[PDB]
Design a protein around this ligand. Structure first.
Ligand SMILES: COc1ccccc1S(=O)(=O)Nc1ccc2c3c(cc(N4CCN(C)CC4)nc13)C(=O)N2C
Length: 125
């Protein structure tokens, strides 16, 4: 069964638009989005559709690129490090729930290296 998806807007949370956050959306996210391995991560895990009834029994802080994309489109974040922590959560979630060598983990590991490649150098203020 599926918990509610993570929030993509929060009116009591202060918004911010930084050069780095614009970067994370326009180059980092949108390039990762197109990767041949991105598709499992473009939406919250649907534990019913994917027959992963134990996913949200194991994963207590779900995160996906679809959630990150909408948070970025809504200036949900205060700074880029907040966004980068969401990406890191998505990857570590995948490593927690699965085990080394699974196809999904091979996909996450590849995306993580592309992600770490692209955030090595961010714009400045
Ligand atoms: C088996 O399925 C897939 C395998 C590879 C790619 C895509 C699918 S998928 O699109 O069919 N399903 C999934 C989509 C998204 C996820 C998972 C994760 C683990 C996982 N499993 C690992 C194997 N195990 C026997 C079943 C559960 N499957 C999916 C997981 O961390 N994420 C975020």
């Amino acid at each position: 069964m599926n918990p509610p998806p993570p929030e993509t807007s929060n009116p009591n949370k202060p918004k911010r638009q930084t050069n780095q956050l614009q970067y994370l959306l326009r180059v980092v996210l949108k390039t990762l989005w197109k990767h041949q391995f991105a598709w499992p991560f473009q939406q919250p895990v649907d534990a019913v559709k994917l027959n992963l009834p134990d996913y949200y029994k194991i994963i207590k802080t779900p995160m996906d690129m679809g959630t990150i994309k909408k948070r970025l489109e809504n200036n949900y974040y205060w700074n880029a490090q907040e966004c980068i922590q969401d990406f890191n959560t998505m990857f570590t979630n995948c490593y927690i729930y699965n085990k080394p060598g699974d196809d999904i983990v091979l996909m996450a590991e590849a995306l993580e290296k592309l992600f770490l490649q692209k955030i090595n150098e961010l714009p400045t203020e």
